[PDB]
């Protein structure tokens, strides 16, 4: 499969999530994700073939994940917007007040601006903290994919937010939108994992 | 906030 940031994947042909950013260790191929999205050692396929497993995650307390690939995947320095990409060119962290998008197989490419840092999201499953927050719209299944400026540099990866009763934040105005993504750095940092771009 |  051809890596891409934003496209849906199954974990263990149950849940579906997004992903997040085509990345390496070494030799290793791999994507970020939520961590929320799979157990260590948990299948994960893109249009129904085993591409690779869970290698390692966090969650709840932060939520992150890599998933090691099969050395036949393609690994892309893009983000899916519709039929069009957005290339990674880095990680430089945005401030507070800086436009970013967010790709998901679940709402698509949808943009705002960052809020909010350092936010704690109390999920049912325990919290989880220092979140960043922005008011793109976001919906169930967008969990793990990218969140990225236009000019290429990746935020982090989708974590969660307030979703309604219709599975996303997208029908109430971005003044009430909370909508929270985990920092790609510490994740980057925390596995020896290297960006791809171009 | 619910996770996603």
């Excluded at chain 1, 099969?70 to 990680?91: D, H, I, K, Y």
């Excluded at chain 1, 996303?168 to 940092?189: K, V």
């Amino acid at each position: 499969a051809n890596i891409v940031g934003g496209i849906e994947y199954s974990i263990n042909n149950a849940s579906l999530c997004s992903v997040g950013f085509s990345v390496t260790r070494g030799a290793t191929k791999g994507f970020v994700t939520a961590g929320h999205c799979g157990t260590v050692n948990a299948t994960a396929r893109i249009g129904g073939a085993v591409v690779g497993t869970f290698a390692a995650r966090v969650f709840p307390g932060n939520d992150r994940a890599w998933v090691s690939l099969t050395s036949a995947q393609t690994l892309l320095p893009r983000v899916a917007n519709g039929s069009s990409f957005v290339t990674v060119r880095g990680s430089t962290e945005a401030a507070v007040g800086a436009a970013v998008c967010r790709s998901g197989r679940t709402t698509g490419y949808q943009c705002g601006t960052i809020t909010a840092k350092n936010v704690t999201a109390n999920y049912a499953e325990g919290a989880v903290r220092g979140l960043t927050q922005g008011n793109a719209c976001m919906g169930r299944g967008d969990s793990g994919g990218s969140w990225i400026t236009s000019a290429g540099q990746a935020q982090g990866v989708m974590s969660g937010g307030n979703v309604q009763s219709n599975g996303n934040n997208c029908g109430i105005p971005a003044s009430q939108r909370s909508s929270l993504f985990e920092r790609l750095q510490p994740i980057l940092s925390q596995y020896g994992l290297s960006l791809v771009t171009g | 906030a619910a996770p996603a």
